[PDB]
Symmetry: C3
Subunit: 485 residues, 3 copies
């Protein structure tokens, strides 16, 4: 007597197929990454620029509260809080702010630099400040910026700078808008004033826009800031009959690519990732994750699913080809060196001897299958999160529509892929078993009786060198023309 | 004798698989929604704002042709004609108009409030009108706006402000008048160095009028340029003008849960209901895909180019991979009406169609799950689709088109091929079930019967309607029947 | 002795499947397109507008370095160098430049009309040139524009209008001069508080000169800022200026079906044809995928990040899921070469390879259908891909990149996996056909023959060449042969 059977264990893994729900399997691999390390990490060896709770504006202008900052020279992304507490301490706006932020997203090198020393505004006053930028508790001001009437005269202010730093330079300036026509004279004299900033490509003229306005930080005045990139060996010319907030500093900047701003309170911790999320770093080979939509790095595809379990083992019992949970009605707790095997009753012994020849071919197959799903996923570096001003609602909605479209696609394809490939894994094991059965039947024939539950009853004395020959697929039919039938 | 077979009926239902086109199948399920109710509907309980043929601009400003309009306080989308006829009766433009429309697209609450009553403009003339906005047939003007003009030979500094104590964020619109020429200016406003000033916490604006000759539109050379802002709560707006100010009299309390879309159509609201509206009519369906119209609003099936997505659910109809169906069992049985697979038996007593409950149920279950899988894994958030762009945003509109199309192509391909591949396996599943049933009998009878030819066993012994039973229900006893009429 | 067999050959063609790698297969089809004809072509009958090394701005304005440019009236897409040498020869900017280029990407129809002859500017000087725009080697200027300057010590109000009676929509470009300083302003235009004012029915613009010191570009400190409009049919455009106006002489009649793209390339038009163009060359193909280059224009296969997409069409080549191929029948027969599956017979006469036409044909049909399903379900509208963004639209450009990459990821994955999955199934399909063939023979014989093992039956009786043909072609009486050597 020699039986064919398959492995069963005490596993409680459930997988789903297109055809069945909650099916207990023998072994399974989840292909959805759901763990992060809870740390904010460096991206490929380079840290993020951490803005504490300053805004980029607050930092670049030199809000006094951003004094204790610590500017690294490199950074691979930016950490900003959702709503930072120290931005424009003096009330105002920042032209093309979102574009400036996108630019400074990632930097190869970034160095502040003095380019228009304040002391050389010989003909103007340079010490104007405000209680809005107060330092317990005197008027102060953006530390990176500087002009008001000297005596009762505001002459044309006209300085320029040639970028000899050998790097592209960021440069910011501003224009002030007083409360009313008097404040405008008490500060600048003349009333038809302008601010002129020009480079080889930049060319801009601003005039004061005066309106009655509620106080913000105790101020009715406003300041509007603009910025340009000054190419190397180019010069920038300032000219103003009043209202100019001048830079004292510029910033050298080089860029390789781009990146993103990550909203979070977390702090740099000193580990390493190829992939960051506002929850923690992700370290995975898997093609999918459900940690958080707003990643930066080379990430697994984000999916709405919360389980993607591939079956790797076979159905687990105490399908398509009629053997497993079929004509062979149960699994063997006892066979534990393979997936499919033999069980002999002999004069000598009995008799669990798993089939290596075939269990092997299955390990490879199911190995290849899992690796196909994982290894085909192309993953470039992306930043996901983005920024839009409140007059860019449509454009923000376009972006949401796009991210949501891909999310639906990947979720659906990942769910259906798992379902289909599970139907096919189980049928695979079922056919492996049916084929082992048929490989024995096609050897024995007359020499054995088929019982019905996967058994062969031997018509002739068989012994250990006999089975050990069926197993190895080398049993000679001639040698046993006993016909006890 | 006992025989194994499968169900057949009078179906003409055709499906396609990866391998064969035009296969006749026993039962099937179209998974493509193709029909609508042709009505224009209320979306999850909430009506659309219906503009008739005003534009949002005309409506907000109070174009007098928009008088009959019927304003509602809630609304879930907007119905506008492609080319509305009553917009800005006095010619002009609306700054960031598309952003303003997008804003108004969906609203949890919306209420007009009188914030700057006309009467309190004591020092100016208020009855200022125009033949461009005439009310049969006297000059009028937008009913929500105030055209400040000189009173006597004077136009003093016009200076008013409003603190938003309304409890909600408030939309405010104002305008500045661009006259046709110096004489229109003087007769309207006396002064000449004029300007309009508007300031809030975050808003800061000073506009100066541009006198200049322009072609006439609705008989006007002048132009009016409108701007808007959202006034936050407990914030104040300050207006100051020496002329050319078109003042609001009203502001709009607005609250927004989320965002929606403007649906361009001729149809009108009709008192039905949906989770999904299109310009042709509403859609009510579980199906994962539709082909009705790309510009839907709400929770909708995926839109595909395809116009047939039919899932085989029954078997190949014969009045495969495993070789039973249309194979070694040559055809199906019209006779068997209560199951997918079963037995034919020939007895000294009777004959003889008995359905195989057990395995027919395995299949009713599997195929139920397969359909539910295809349908229920489909993630359907609420979306708007339709989008608005100015004539100077062609590239942006084209970006959106490239995106909507990219997705159309993806969903189309994936659904078409999903259907094809899952059809090939559905058939082969039924095939497998029939072959395993045949084998369950063969392994059970062994010598006691002869394998006949086409799914048939001839017993080498007498078998009554009790013995048959043991076969059909798996309990056949071999040992008992050692008759070898062999 | 009858034997069931299957085709084998000298093919070294390799495929991958979900389950195995580097499987040698009998025949294969690549469904990934990678050849291009290296030519730059015309698109469905219509040529590209070829800019040489001008920029569109340069061309429209009439840069002297574009005189010899050859303008067709129609064009279907534009060819520009990634970086042209001849644009604004006199320094400045072009408002809404990317919008303009996108509008001119593809055109019906496009001719240049003379709307405002220079000599009708009688109160002004018209010949103003510049060294920046020089013609070997005197001072010239954009051939299509007029630089209005003072006559003697006077600059009267410059004021003309033009009614678009051309019958087509009309493109019109104007400019404003930004001088280096007050004295340059005065020697050119006399007056100081100048403005340029342009108005149509819908356009309404007023510019003031920005006099200020700038670095020198092309030897010039001044700048010119150009703007553009589309003048609708029968509408008029008013020009009014007190100085600094760069007037147009010409306007461009324009008509458009739809939109296209700009192709950045060095190549030049080469007199052929495509439905699909890339910067490396044209593509002629039926295949659904290509990996030639992402920036295509026309109706194109899907661009994939992969470089082999090989579908098995033939069978596992042996010099499966159903146990037959490289299973209980261990080798393929080099011998039989008129079918995929068939028989070998041990006889007294011949012996012996006989194809099974009927089964082989049902497999050619199936696999032919599989390949066609994969290729023919791929929908391809016409798209341009390549896009254009000013350097203050980095966010918007990144949005476009996140979009193209996203589709690229989706298509590459689905395609790679499609191929792998359909390959595992193609192989199992052949395996099943062999197996079923074998089982067709077995269920026919029975008692009559001996199941040997490697797919062979040993006969219990004489079977002469004509007996065989009853097995092979599936009509063979069992009755006849009661000869029991057993």
């Amino acid at each position: 007597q020699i039986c064919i059977g398959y492995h069963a264990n005490n596993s409680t893994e459930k997988v789903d197929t297109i055809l069945e729900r909650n099916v207990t399997v023998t072994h399974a691999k989840d292909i959805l990454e759901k763990t992060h390390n809870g740390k904010l990490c460096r991206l490929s060896g380079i840290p993020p620029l951490e803005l504490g709770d300053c805004s980029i504006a607050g930092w670049l202008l030199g809000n006094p509260e951003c004094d204790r900052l610590l500017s690294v020279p490199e950074w691979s992304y930016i950490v900003e809080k959702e709503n930072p507490t120290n931005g424009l301490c003096y009330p105002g706006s920042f032209n093309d702010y979102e574009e400036l932020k996108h630019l400074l997203t990632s930097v190869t090198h970034f160095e502040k630099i003095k380019i228009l020393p304040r002391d050389q505004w010989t003909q103007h006053t340079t010490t104007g400040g405000s209680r809005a930028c107060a330092v317990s508790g005197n008027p102060s001001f953006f530390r990176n910026m500087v002009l008001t009437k000297k005596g009762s005269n505001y002459p044309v202010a006209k300085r320029s700078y040639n970028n000899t730093s050998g790097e592209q330079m960021l440069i910011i300036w501003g224009i002030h808008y007083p409360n009313d026509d008097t404040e405008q004279r008490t500060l600048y004299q003349n009333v038809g004033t302008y601010v002129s900033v020009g480079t080889s490509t930049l060319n801009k003229r601003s005039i004061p826009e005066i309106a009655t306005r509620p106080k913000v930080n105790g101020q009715g005045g406003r300041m509007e800031f603009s910025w340009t990139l000054l190419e190397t060996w180019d010069v920038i010319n300032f000219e103003s009959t009043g209202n100019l907030i001048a830079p004292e500093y510029g910033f050298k900047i080089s860029k390789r690519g781009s990146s993103g701003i990550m909203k979070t309170e977390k702090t740099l911790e000193n580990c390493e990732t190829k992939c960051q999320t506002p929850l923690g770093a992700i370290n995975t080979t898997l093609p999918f994750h459900n940690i958080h939509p707003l990643t930066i790095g080379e990430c697994p595809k984000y999916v709405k699913s919360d389980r993607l379990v591939l079956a790797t083992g076979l159905r687990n019992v105490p399908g398509l080809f009629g053997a497993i949970a079929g004509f062979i009605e149960g699994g063997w707790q006892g066979m534990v060196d393979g997936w499919y095997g033999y069980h002999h009753s002999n004069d000598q012994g009995s008799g669990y001897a798993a089939d290596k020849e075939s269990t092997q071919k299955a390990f490879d197959g199911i190995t290849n299958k899992v690796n196909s799903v994982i290894a085909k996923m192309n993953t470039q570096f992306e930043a996901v999160g983005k920024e839009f001003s409140n007059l860019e609602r449509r454009l923000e909605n376009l972006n949401k529509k796009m991210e949501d479209g891909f999310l639906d696609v990947w979720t659906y394809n990942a769910e259906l892929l798992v379902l289909m490939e599970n139907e096919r894994t189980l049928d695979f094991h079922d056919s492996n078993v049916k084929n082992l059965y048929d490989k024995v039947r096609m050897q024995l024939r007359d020499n054995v009786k088929e019982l019905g539950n996967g058994c062969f009853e031997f018509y002739h004395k068989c012994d250990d060198e006999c089975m050990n020959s069926v197993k190895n697929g080398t049993y000679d039919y001639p040698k046993y023309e006993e016909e006890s039938k």
